Amino acid sequence: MKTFKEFLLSLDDSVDETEAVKRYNDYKLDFRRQQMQDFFLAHKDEEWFRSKYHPDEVGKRRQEARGALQNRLRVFLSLMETGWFDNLLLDIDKADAIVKMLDAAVIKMEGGTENDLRILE
């Protein structure tokens, strides 16, 4: 895109201040209209762009997210009632407990039983 200096310079006949600022602000939008229509057709069928904006794929990622998240909740709710952060404070003094707790969380995220956690002891 060409800046305000350049567009005014290419109109040396009907040279008004009121008309110049209107036509440049119209040109701005006239150009940015083109860029969006170019960009849409440029990245039309790409999965990242499809997923963010296309109704069918937008619905899928929400369902995929909710299901993966609900499983991450179950882990927190398991760590609560198991009490993996029963005596745990987010402090550098209690750093080794956090790292062990996170590893215990990841195992539950994958879906391992209490027998799987025994290696951390």
Added chain:
Amino acid sequence: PRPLHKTCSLFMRNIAPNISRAEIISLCKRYPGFMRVALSEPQPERRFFRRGWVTFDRSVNIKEICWNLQNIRLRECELSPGVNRDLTRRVRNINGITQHKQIVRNDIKLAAKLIHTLDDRTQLWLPSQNPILKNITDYLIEEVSAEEEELLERDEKLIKVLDKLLLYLRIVHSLDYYNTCEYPNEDEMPNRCGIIHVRGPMPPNRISHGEVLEWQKTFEEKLTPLLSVRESLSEEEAQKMGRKDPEQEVEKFVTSNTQELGKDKWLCPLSGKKFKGPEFVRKHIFNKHAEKIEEVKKEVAFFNNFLTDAKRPALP
């Protein structure tokens, strides 16, 4: 006993945007002990090129598998993977001022709002019916029999309350509180809960009177980006920029299909069937080819959805 907490992995720089998950998955699926693939946000400065992490079972070795993919290409570009080593410094430090009476109380106020927003936004659980927001709000109370008497620096109570919110925010929503950042893709990435930021050691000096207010103004100003909704433009500007009407552009599909070969003889190229007038071809497309009329509406909404967003992807 299984070591499921450990998982070794590959890393790939400069993956193309036309490449999807599906076809990276199929490339790595026929290896043994394959788990999952995770791609990052495509950055505009590199022409929207992604960064991938293929994660494996920790038993099966990575260095041979990285070599077996070392000079392989997908779609229209060459991958050249590298071995992604494990995370070094997990439990990181921040300011020691955060272990304070007034500051923890505000951290609990913020953490409540974060969960209130994120729960509603993600569509888990109009007051929030999450148990840790009800059950914790019951606590943080003085309870005394003052009526019966009338007639006759750390605060670990609040910190132990804060930890339950912060650990929920970190574990459930992948939100590192003390760093003030999300890990959005994290659940697919090799390490499911890597970096976590934690309260500092001590505050050496006397805790300054305005410095507690200054910390919160810096801290809350950084948290405000994390709560922000997708910035939709004004319904003028969306229409000006070029919002397509659904019913209008559906009419454009029907008429442009309904071609004329002669006098009272109309064909459409969505079947190969000729009719006696322009009215007969309209009822043919609506009734028999209901799949296409939705397909137009969907791709109109697809283009609209892009225009709706103010903070879009574009070339710098």
